[PDB]
Amino acid sequence: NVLTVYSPYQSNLIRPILNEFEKQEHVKIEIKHGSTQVLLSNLHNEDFSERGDVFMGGVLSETIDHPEDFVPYQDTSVTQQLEDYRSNNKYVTSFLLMPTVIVVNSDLQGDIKIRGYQDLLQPILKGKIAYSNPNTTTTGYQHMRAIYSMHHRVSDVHQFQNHAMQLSKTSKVIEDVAKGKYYAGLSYEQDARTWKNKGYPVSIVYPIEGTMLNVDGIALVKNAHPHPKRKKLVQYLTSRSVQQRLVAEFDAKSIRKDVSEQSDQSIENLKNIPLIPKSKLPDIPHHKFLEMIQ
């Protein structure tokens, strides 16, 4: 039987890692791709008999609007995960940590100071910065949550949306910033480094007011015939050796305590990133937060 995985990650980024699981467990893994919301929506409209087995990746704890589409599951090895980011959610297992970032074009920046969201509101940057549609992309959604978290004001979101160009796709944000069409943009660390690594003049800024950390998750999909290897896949993806490879390849931070960085000095340590205080992180359902800002 084929193990079917829903994933918003690009195929070429997860297929080599899933290929090793295929060899270890003597199973074949088919991947269904798309945006997080589109995968979720098509899953919700699938019958019980045609649904896949695992949803791998995406900010599931923040975007799942239909909890009845997933199976409750908590591995006993959850004690190995960072306490601040363990899933408070029965049907999601925390997987990877991905900082959202402001990406800055270093060819264009000059002396313009860009340390966070309020620097982006400078008159010299009006119409010269970009972000992705929060209604269709989790990156834009997470950034609007971060802006809303500054003062718990919907008006802060609207003021930013009257200052920055909205693009339909998150990938277009980093591409157009890197190519010099915009001075800055709202992206995430992995996307920024992808273009930085091929020579483009991009800098990475953690917003000083508060930096939204994406908690990507894994979820078992409720179907009529669960694949018996799917729980082993969750354990595989959350294992110590696999998390070490994922951190190196995705430019992410591990969910595990024994992989996380604690050397005081280094920027890869989470404590050196100005994260949003936990008390301020919007605890609003995905569909309701969008309604607030429409």
């Binding site: 480094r193 050796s241 070490q244 490879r245 951190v247 190196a248 960085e261 050397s263 890869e268």
Partner: protein, 170 residues
């Protein structure tokens, strides 16, 4: 002829992959002493990787990837998707774990037989996916089908993985 060109390239690629694995084995303990956040240890690692690259006949590019760190000799930013992924290693350094991938862009033999003898090269897996091609008629990623174009060919099995090297000629 083709047969004398297929066995030399297989044996050369067989030897190069061995030298990579041996390199890894012999540098295991040394890598665990190297902190890649320290610029002295980065230089020491680049010296070892560039030494290994130029000990091999083929044109090889390395990508050493870690948390928010990317070390490569692909200075012109050639697309690695048009290259042959030729080894992958998960390496423990002093500060973190890094992934080392080595890509083959060309070999002096395959480039010569393509120029002098118009003999081209393909690398396909047991699933028949194209993993390398120095001929623009073929596209990386797509499936191989000998009949459609149907040239005089000869294939051998590569030693390190379930791959086949195919050299053909019109």
């Amino acid at each position: 002829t083709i047969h004398q060109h297929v066995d030399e390239s297989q044996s050369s690629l067989h030897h190069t992959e061995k030298q990579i694995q041996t390199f890894i084995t012999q540098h295991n303990n040394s890598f665990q002493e190297l902190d890649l956040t320290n610029h002295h240890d980065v230089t020491a690692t680049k010296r070892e990787l560039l030494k290994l690259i130029h000990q091999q006949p083929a044109t090889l590019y390395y990508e050493l990837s870690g948390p928010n760190q990317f070390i490569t000799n692909n200075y012109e930013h050639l697309n690695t998707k048009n290259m042959y992924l030729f080894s992958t290693h998960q390496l423990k350094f002093k500060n973190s774990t890094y992934m080392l991938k080595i890509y083959m862009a060309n070999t002096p033999r395959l480039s010569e037989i393509k120029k002098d003898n118009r003999q081209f090269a393909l690398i396909v897996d047991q699933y028949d996916n194209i993993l390398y091609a120095n001929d623009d008629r073929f596209t990386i990623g797509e499936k191989y089908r000998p009949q459609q174009f149907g040239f005089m060919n000869e294939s051998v099995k590569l030693n390190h993985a379930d791959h086949r090297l195919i050299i053909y000629k019109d």
